[PDB]
Design a protein around this ligand. Structure first.
Ligand code: BEF
Ligand SMILES: [Mg+2]
Length: 1090
C-alpha cells in the first residue's frame, strides 16, 4: 500500500475505479422502479416524480465533496501496481484534499510510477514503498568541496529530467465549467430559475424559454469576461533566453527551461525584461545584484566568489557564506569574469561561472508563489432580503387564499394567484440592473488602466479603515539617483546644502571624472556600475574608446593606471594625467578615507552623520598632487578633501498628494517595508505618515537574549525594554512619540500580552520578512478593521492575497501606454512587466502612479451607495406591489392597458436612470452604510410603507363614503371607467414618484439629483401627468386616458392627500436619517496631536 511522505500530506489511500454498474445509485433503484411498474399496472404520479428527483440527486451527490466522490466512484486497494487514483489528505494549513492520477511510463527497461500534487513532484521508490519528493544537496549540510569540485553534467541525463523536472513556472488557470459552477450557486440564480419553473408550470412556454435563454446568456457573458481577465493577468513574466551551460566538457548554449541542479552556467550582465534564472551559487567571479524585487532593499549588493574558502572541512553555511548566493528574480547590474585559471576554460562571454542549486517551484520566489496559490484558504444580506420578501409574500398569499375560499372560487385560480404573487415578489429588471452596475463600475475603473479579476471586491473599498503601503517600488523608485555634492566649503553655516552641479571647483570636477572604472569598447558601448554612469553623466563627462576621456566642457583627461575596488578596506584609486599637472584621485567610503587624508575639516563628521542617518549613501572622494608603476599605499599616503556624492531613491511626484488626500479623509495609512529603519522613517516622515518625533524598536546589543531598545533616530533618548519583564508605558511612550517596530523586535514580542495594544500605535514596520506581512494583515483583520495593501514586489504576495482589497502597481507611463495602444491598433519607453505581485492582487493598476488607490476608493464608495439605494427602492416597491395585489385585486379595481403602459414606460426610464450617476471629486470623511439590515434603513422603509398604506386606506374610505360600496363583487369582469380607478391610479403614480424622490438623494457621495438628467426628466414627467390628470387641466387627454370626470371637493381632497403623503414620507425619512445615521470613522483613523 502506498504512503506519501511529505509535510503537506496527512494520510493517503489508494483507489481503483469501479465499473458503471458498480456505482451505488444505479443497481438498487431498479427494484423500486419494478415495484412502481407493478403497482401502476392521479395520486401516483407524484411518486414517479419524487423518485426521478431522488435518483438525479443521488447522481449529482459526489460533485460537492471529494471524499464522497472517492467513497462512491472508487474502491480502496493496497497494491500500487494496480491503483489508478490516490486520495491525498493534506495537513490542516496546506490547501485542501484532492484526487490525483497515478501516472506511469517505462524508462530504460524499468517503469517509474509518479504523480504530482500542488506542483510538488512525487515518485515511487520501491525500497521504501513510499512516494518521496526530491531532496536537493543544498537542503542538507553539504561540504564546500562538493561544490568546488563540480564539472557539469555528463552522459545521458534522462533520469535527472524525471527526478527534478524542468525549470518552468507554469501556473494553471480554471476552465469555463469550474468557473460557472460558482455562479450557478448564488441565491439570485437559483431563485430566478425556480421562478421560471413555477411560471412555466402554468403559463406559456415560448416566453419562459426566451427568459431562460437570457438568464443563460448573462452568466455566459460574465464568466467569459472574468475568464479573459484571468487568462490575461494570472501569469508571471518568464521568457527563456539562451545561456551557455557546461555539459560534456564543452560550453554549449542551452535555454533557460533546460537547467538542472549542479549544472555550471555562465551568468552575464542581465539585460532588461530578464532576471537570474534560478538559485545559483557563485563558483568564481563577482557581481553586483539588485535584490529590490525579491528582498525589498534599495542598495545593490556586491557578491563574491567561493574559491578562496578551504574546501576540506568548512561547510556551506548560508550564514557568513551569504556573499556568494544569487537568488532567482534579481537583476545583475555588473559581472566580473574569473581572474585566474581553473580546471575548466573560462566562459566565451565575459560572465562569471556559477552552480545551479534549485529549479522550478523549489526556489525561493517559486516557493512563495506556490504557497500563495495552493496553500491559501458573507452573502447573507441577499439571503435575508429574500427571506423578508418571501415572508411578506406568504402573508399576502395567505390573505388572498382565505378571501378566495370565502368568496367561492376554484382552487386552480387561487393557486395561480399565489404563484403570481410569489413571482412578482421581485421585479424582472433586477439581474440586468446588477449586471449593468458591475459593467459600469468596471468600465469606469478601466479608464485609468485599472483591471480587476474579482468584481465583488469593489464594494469592499467603500469602508476601508487601514491603508498599508510598500516603500521600495511603490512610493519610491528602486534605482539610486544623484543628488549633489556636499562638504565642499569652509564656512560651516549649514550642513544640508547640496551644490547640484556647475558649481564645484576644477579639482572636484576633475576627480569625479578621473577616479572611475567605466570603459568604452571598440564597437562602442559603456559598461560598469550604473550609479557611476549616472554621476559621470550628471557631472557632464564623455568617455572615449581609450581610457583617456575628454569633452567635459573644460578640457581633456587621461588615466595612466587605475586600481580595483576591494571587498575589505572598501575604496578605490586612480592615477590620472592632465595637461597642467598630475594628480591621483581616491574615492571610497568616508569612514576609511577619513583616517587616510592629512587635513581633517571641521564638518566632516557632522556632514557624514547627517547624510548617513537618513537614507542617503554618501561617497567621500579625495585627491593629491603627484609629481613624476607605483604601489597603492604610497599613493594613498596623504590626500585632500574635495566633497561628497549623495545618492538616494527619489519619491514619486504623486505620493505626497495621495497620502494627504487619504489623511484628510479619515483613513489611517501605515507603511510595511523591508528596508533599514532609517530610510523607512525618513521616507515616511517626508511623505506624511508620521509627524513628530519617532522611536525605533531594534536589538539593543548584538549577540542574543532578545532585549529591545527604544531609541531615537539620533542618539538623544534610549529607553530599554525586556519582553518578559517590562510592559508598555502608554503615558510616556505613545502620547509623546511616534514609534516604528523593526522585524527582530516584532519577532521577539511574540506571545506578549500587549502586542495588539502596540500594533494599535505603530505606523512604520521596517525590515520585515515576507512571512510577517501576512501575520500583520491577519492581526489587523482579526482586530476588526478593513485593510488594504498596495505593493509591487514578490515578498508581499501573501500580503496582497490576504488583504480585503489588494492592488499591484506595475510600471508604465500614460504616454507610453497611449503609444503602445496606437501601435497595436495600427498593426491590427520600456514595456511593462507582469511580475509575481499581479498574480495575487485582484486589482492591477497598469500605470505606476499611486493615485490608483484614491480612484479605486472613489469608485467603491459610489458602487456601495448604488447597491444600498437599489436594495431600498426594490424593497419599498415590492412591499407596495404586494399590498396593491392582495387588497386592491380583492375589489373591482383594474386599469386599461393604455394607462398602464404609459406610466410603466416612464417608471422603467427612471428605474434605469437610477444606476447612472457620477461620483464627486472630493473624498468625504463620512462613509456609506454596510448592508441594508440595520435600524436606520429598516425603520425608514417600514415607516414609508406605513405612510403609504395609511394614505391609501384614507382615500379608499373617502371614496366608499362618496359612492356606494357594492358588497357583491367579481374578479372576472373587464375594465370599466369608474371613479375608484382614477382615485387609486393617481395615488399610485404619486407613491411611485415619492419612492424615488425621497430615497435617491445622496449628496456627499455622488453628484446631486439635478445633474442626473434622465431620472429628473422622468420624475418631472410623471408628476406633471399626475397633477394634470388630478385637476383635469386638459380634458382632451383625460378623455383619451379613460378617466371619468369628478366633482371639485373630491379633487381638492385628493390633491391635499397627495401633498400630505409626499411631505410626510420625506419628513419621516429625514427624521430617521437625522437621528440614527451613525456614519463614524474607526478609532484608529482619528489623528491627535502629540
Ligand atoms: F519595500 Be517593499 F516591501 F517592496
Ligand atoms: Mg516593492
Amino acid at each position: 500500500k502506498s504512503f506519501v511522505s511529505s509535510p503537506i500530506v496527512r494520510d493517503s489511500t489508494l483507489l481503483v475505479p469501479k465499473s458503471l454498474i458498480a456505482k451505488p445509485y444505479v443497481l438498487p433503484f431498479f427494484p423500486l422502479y419494478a415495484t412502481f411498474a407493478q403497482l401502476y399496472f392521479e395520486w401516483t404520479f407524484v411518486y414517479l416524480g419524487t423518485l426521478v428527483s431522488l435518483n438525479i440527486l443521488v447522481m449529482l451527490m459526489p460533485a460537492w465533496n471529494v471524499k464522497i466522490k472517492a467513497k462512491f466512484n472508487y474502491s480502496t486497494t493496497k497494491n500500487v501496481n494496480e491503483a489508478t487514483h490516490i486520495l491525498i489528505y493534506t495537513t490542516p494549513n496546506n490547501g485542501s484534499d484532492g484526487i490525483v492520477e497515478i501516472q506511469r511510463v517505462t524508462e530504460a527497461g524499468s517503469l517509474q510510477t509518479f504523480f504530482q500534487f500542488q506542483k510538488k513532484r512525487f515518485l515511487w521508490h520501491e525500497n521504501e514503498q513510499v512516494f518521496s519528493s526530491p531532496k536537493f544537496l543544498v537542503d542538507e549540510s553539504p561540504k564546500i568541496g562538493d561544490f568546488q569540485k563540480c564539472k557539469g553534467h555528463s552522459g545521458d541525463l534522462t533520469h535527472l529530467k524525471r527526478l527534478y523536472g524542468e525549470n518552468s513556472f507554469d501556473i494553471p488557470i480554471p476552465t469555463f465549467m469550474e468557473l460557472f459552477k460558482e455562479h450557478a450557486v448564488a441565491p439570485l440564480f437559483v431563485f430566478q430559475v425556480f421562478c421560471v419553473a413555477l411560471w412555466l408550470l402554468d403559463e406559456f412556454w415560448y416566453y419562459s424559454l426566451f427568459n431562460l435563454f437570457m438568464i443563460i446568456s448573462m452568466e455566459a457573458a460574465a464568466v467569459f469576461q472574468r475568464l479573459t481577465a484571468l487568462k490575461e493577468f494570472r501569469t508571471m513574466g518568464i521568457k527563456p533566453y539562451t545561456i551557455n551551460v557546461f555539459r560534456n566538457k564543452k560550453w554549449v548554449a542551452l535555454q533557460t527551461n533546460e537547467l538542472l541542479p549542479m549544472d555550471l552556467v555562465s551568468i552575464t550582465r542581465t539585460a532588461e525584461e530578464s532576471a537570474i534564472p534560478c538559485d545559483l551559487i557563485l563558483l568564481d567571479g563577482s557581481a553586483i545584484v539588485n535584490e529590490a524585487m525579491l528582498s525589498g532593499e534599495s542598495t545593490p549588493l556586491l557578491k563574491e566568489s567561493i574559491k578562496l574558502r578551504p574546501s576540506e572541512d568548512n561547510l556551506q553555511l548560508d550564514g557568513v557564506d551569504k556573499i556568494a548566493v544569487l537568488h532567482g528574480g534579481t537583476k545583475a547590474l555588473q559581472v566580473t569574469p574569473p581572474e585566474h585559471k581553473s580546471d575548466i576554460p573560462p566562459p566565451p562571454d565575459g560572465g562569471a561561472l556559477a552552480i545551479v542549486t534549485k529549479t522550478g517551484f523549489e526556489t525561493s520566489q517559486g516557493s512563495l508563489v506556490r504557497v500563495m496559490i495552493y496553500s491559501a484558504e458573507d452573502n447573507k444580506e441577499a439571503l435575508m432580503f429574500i427571506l423578508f420578501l418571501l415572508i411578506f409574500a406568504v402573508i399576502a398569499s395567505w390573505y388572498v387564499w382565505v378571501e378566495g375560499t370565502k368568496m367561492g372560487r376554484i382552487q386552480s385560480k387561487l393557486i395561480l394567484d399565489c404563484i403570481l404573487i410569489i413571482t412578482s415578489v421581485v421585479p424582472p429588471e433586477l439581474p440586468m440592473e446588477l449586471t449593468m452596475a458591475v459593467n459600469s463600475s468596471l468600465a469606469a475603473l478601466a479608464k485609468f488602466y485599472v483591471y480587476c479579476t474579482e468584481p465583488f471586491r469593489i464594494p469592499f473599498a467603500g469602508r476601508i479603515d487601514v491603508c498599508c503601503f510598500d516603500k521600495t517600488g511603490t512610493l519610491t523608485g528602486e534605482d539610486l539617483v544623484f543628488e549633489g555634492l556636499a562638504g565642499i566649503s569652509a564656512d560651516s553655516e549649514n550642513i544640508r546644502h547640496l551644490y547640484s552641479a556647475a558649481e564645484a571647483p576644477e579639482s572636484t570636477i576633475l576627480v569625479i571624472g578621473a577616479a572611475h572604472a567605466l570603459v568604452k569598447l571598440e564597437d562602442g558601448d559603456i559598461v560598469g556600475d550604473p550609479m557611476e554612469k549616472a554621476t559621470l553623466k550628471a557631472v557632464g563627462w564623455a568617455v572615449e574608446r581609450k581610457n583617456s576621456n575628454y569633452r567635459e566642457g573644460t578640457g581633456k583627461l587621461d588615466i595612466i593606471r587605475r586600481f580595483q575596488f576591494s571587498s575589505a578596506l572598501k575604496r578605490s584609486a586612480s592615477i590620472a594625467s592632465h595637461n597642467d599637472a598630475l594628480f591621483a584621485a581616491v574615492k571610497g567610503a568616508p569612514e576609511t578615507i577619513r583616517e587616510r587624508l592629512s587635513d581633517i575639516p571641521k564638518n566632516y563628521d557632522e556632514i557624514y552623520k547627517s547624510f548617513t542617518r537618513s537614507g542617503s549613501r554618501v561617497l567621500a572622494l579625495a585627491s593629491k598632487s603627484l609629481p613624476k608603476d607605483l604601489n597603492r599605499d604610497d599613493v594613498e599616503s596623504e590626500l585632500t578633501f574635495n566633497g561628497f556624492l549623495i545618492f538616494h531613491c527619489p519619491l514619486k511626484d504623486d505620493a505626497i498628494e495621495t497620502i494627504k488626500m487619504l489623511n484628510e479623509s479619515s483613513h489611517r495609512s501605515i507603511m510595511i517595508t523591508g528596508d533599514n529603519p532609517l530610510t523607512a522613517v525618513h521616507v515616511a516622515k517626508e511623505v506624511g505618515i508620521v509627524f513628530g518625533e519617532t522611536l525605533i524598536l531594534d536589538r539593543a546589543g548584538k549577540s542574543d537574549d532578545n532585549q529591545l531598545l527604544f531609541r531615537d533616530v539620533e542618539e538623544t533618548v534610549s529607553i530599554p525594554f525586556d519582553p518578559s519583564k517590562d510592559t508598555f508605558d502608554h503615558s510616556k511612550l505613545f502620547d509623546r512619540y511616534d514609534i516604528a517596530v523593526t522585524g527582530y523586535a516584532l519577532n521577539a514580542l511574540e506571545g506578549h500580552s500587549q502586542l495588539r495594544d502596540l500594533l494599535r500605535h505603530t505606523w512604520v514596520y521596517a525590515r520585515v520578512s515576507p512571512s510577517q506581512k501576512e501575520f500583520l494583515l491577519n492581526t489587523l483583520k482579526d482586530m476588526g478593521y478593513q485593510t488594504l495593501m498596495c505593493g509591487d514586489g514578490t515578498n508581499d504576495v501573501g500580503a496582497l492575497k490576504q488583504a480585503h482589497v489588494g492592488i499591484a502597481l506595475l510600471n508604465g507611463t500614460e504616454e507610453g501606454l497611449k503609444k503602445l495602444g496606437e501601435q497595436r491598433r495600427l498593426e491590427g519607453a520600456p514595456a511593462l512587466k507582469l511580475g509575481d505581485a499581479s498574480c495575487a492582487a485582484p486589482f492591477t493598476s497598469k500605470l505606476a502612479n499611486v493615485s490608483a488607490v484614491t480612484n479605486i476608493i472613489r469608485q467603491g464608495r459610489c458602487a456601495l451607495v448604488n447597491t444600498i439605494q437599489m436594495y431600498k427602492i426594490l424593497a419599498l416597491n415590492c412591499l407596495i406591489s404586494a399590498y396593491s395585489l392582495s387588497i386592491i385585486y380583492m375589489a373591482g379595481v383594474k386599469f386599461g392597458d393604455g394607462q398602464a403602459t404609459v406610466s410603466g414606460l416612464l417608471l422603467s426610464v427612471c428605474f434605469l436612470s437610477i444606476s447612472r450617476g457620477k461620483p464627486l471629486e472630493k473624498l468625504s470623511k463620512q462613509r456609506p452604510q454596510s448592508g441594508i439590515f440595520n435600524v436606520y434603513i429598516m425603520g425608514s422603509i417600514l415607516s414609508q410603507f406605513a405612510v403609504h398604506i395609511a394614505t391609501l386606506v384614507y382615500i379608499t374610505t373617502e371614496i366608499y363614503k362618496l359612492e356606494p360600496r357594492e358588497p357583491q363583487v367579481d374578479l372576472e369582469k373587464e375594465f370599466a371607467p369608474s371613479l375608484l380607478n382614477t382615485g387609486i391610479f393617481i395615488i399610485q403614480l404619486v407613491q411611485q414618484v415619492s419612492t424615488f424622490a425621497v430615497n435617491y438623494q445622496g449628496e456627499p457621495f455622488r453628484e446631486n439629483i439635478r445633474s442626473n438628467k434622465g431620472m429628473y426628466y422622468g420624475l418631472l414627467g410623471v408628476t406633471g401627468l399626475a397633477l394634470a390628470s388630478a385637476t383635469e387641466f386638459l380634458p382632451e387627454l383625460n378623455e383619451a386616458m379613460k378617466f371619468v370626470p369628478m366633482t371639485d371637493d373630491f379633487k381638492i381632497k385628493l390633491t391635499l392627500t397627495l401633498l400630505l403623503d409626499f411631505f410626510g414620507s420625506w419628513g419621516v425619512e429625514h427624521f430617521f436619517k437625522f437621528f440614527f445615521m451613525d456614519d463614524k470613522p474607526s478609532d484608529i483613523s482619528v489623528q491627535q496631536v502629540k
